[PDB]
């Protein structure tokens, strides 16, 4: 059977109540193995499955810094997107992103994906080729034009076809 590793990020703004809330969960098939919550007291990625606890401190460090840095990108984005849509500063808004990869029964790369949404609807997603973008609207098109000129697709493709598949295979074996 094939398998999948998927990460789900969620940033919710809260005007007059501090920085946005950031939650990140990682899945290997139907099993959640890690989690990050900006409102929790540890401020670090945490294990939620037994087979991941064995990972080293460098892993936890790296994964913690990476998700946090992503959360900061999301807060700049929450502002940018409010302007694109011309909404008030008082409302709360959401940015969601799911990304992952599927491997075959033999653990070979099958598919990869990186998709995001604004306020529960599609915004910008990377096409199957992992080389081009699909913009769901006018606002996303603005993003697409910037991104197609800065080659952010190549950055994601390297991860989705490289790092993603290789770690999924590690998780599959350790679990």
């Amino acid at each position: 059977g094939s398998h999948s590793m998927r990460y789900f990020y969620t940033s919710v703004s809260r005007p007059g109540r501090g920085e946005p809330r950031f939650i990140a969960v990682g899945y290997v098939d139907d099993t959640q193995f890690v989690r990050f919550d900006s409102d929790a007291a540890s401020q670090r990625m945490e294990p939620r499955a037994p087979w991941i606890e064995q990972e080293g401190p460098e892993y936890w460090d790296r994964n913690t810094r990476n998700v946090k840095a992503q959360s900061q990108t999301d807060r700049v984005d929450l502002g940018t997107l409010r302007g694109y849509y011309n909404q008030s500063e008082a409302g709360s808004h959401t940015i969601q992103m799911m990304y992952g990869c599927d491997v075959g029964s033999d653990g070979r790369f099958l598919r990869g994906y990186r998709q995001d949404a604004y306020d529960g609807k599609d915004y910008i997603a990377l096409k199957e080729d992992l080389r081009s973008w699909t913009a769901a609207d006018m606002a996303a098109q603005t993003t697409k034009h910037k991104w197609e000129a800065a080659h952010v697709a190549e950055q994601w493709r390297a991860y989705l076809e490289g790092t993603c598949v290789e770690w999924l295979r590690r998780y599959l074996e350790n679990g």
């Binding site: 990460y7 990140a24 990682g26 990625m45 892993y59 994964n63 990476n66 998700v67 840095a69 992503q70 900061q72 990108t73 700049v76 984005d77 940018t80 997107l81 990304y99 990186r114 915004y123 910008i124 993003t143 910037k146 991104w147 800065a150 952010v152 950055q155 994601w156 991860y159 989705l160 790092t163 993603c164 770690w167």
Partner: peptide, 10 residues
Amino acid sequence: EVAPPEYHRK
């Protein structure tokens, strides 16, 4: 293993 942080703004 999480993807590197997105550096490109929307």
